[PDB]
Amino acid sequence: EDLSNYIVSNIQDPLSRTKGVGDFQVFGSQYSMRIWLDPAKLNSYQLTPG
Amino acid sequence: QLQEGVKQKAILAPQQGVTRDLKGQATALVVNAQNKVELRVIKADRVIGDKW
Incomplete structure (x- = not known):
């Protein structure tokens, strides 16, 4: 996923500006702010993921 | 500020x-004793004015 973010970040910008290159896909996609909940801390504060 | x-x-x-x-x-980015730039990963707790 680090390599896929590196591709979509800064080798997809010079690649598609060249001549002749049509549409294309990459394996995976860019990053995402993945937030990891845990149920013990949600119990400890009287919280729910909603 | 405790x-x-x-x-x-x-x-x-x-x-x-x-x-x-x-x-x-x-x-x-750090340098070595063989004079070559090497990258080292940092974790940083606090800030004190202008330094980590």
């Missing part, structure tokens, strides 16, 4: 010397 503890062995990297890379970690 005050607690002293660390007698602490290192204060400057703010200009450490820069977040594209993942989210903190990386600082």
Whole structure:
């Protein structure tokens, strides 16, 4: 996923500006702010993921 | 501002010397004894004015 973010970040910008290159896909996609909940801390504060 | 503890062995990297890379970690560029630039991963707790 680090390599896929590196591709979509800064080798997809010079690649598609060249001549002749049509549409294309990459394996995976860019990053995402993945937030990891845990149920013990949600119990400890009287919280729910909603 | 509560005050607690002293660390007698602490290192204060400057703010200009450490820069977040594209993942989210903190990386600082160091040199070796063989005079070649190497990257080292940093974790940083506090800020004191202008230093990490």
